């Protein structure tokens, strides 16, 4: 969340690491749960 807070206000350094490393919804439809 804090990464989003600083990314909104243009760019101010902070090249620490790849904190997000996530995929986009995987196009998966699991029936039951989880």
């Amino acid at each position: 969340i804090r990464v989003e807070e600083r990314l909104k206000k243009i760019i101010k350094g902070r090249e620490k690491n790849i904190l997000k490393p996530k995929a986009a919804s995987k196009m998966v439809v699991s029936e039951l749960k989880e």
């Binding site: 998966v28 439809v29 699991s30 749960k33 989880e34």
Partner: protein
Amino acid sequence: FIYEKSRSGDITQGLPKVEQVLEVRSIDSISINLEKRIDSWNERITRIL
């Protein structure tokens, strides 16, 4: 003196009840139960799928 009677079968109970449910001004037909379901769905749509 105060006595409780015991009618309260329901407010309108004929043409006016049918008019009330058919004319959906506010969704309150069985919204003591239906509105709960509808709001639950509308808030729970965002899920894994």
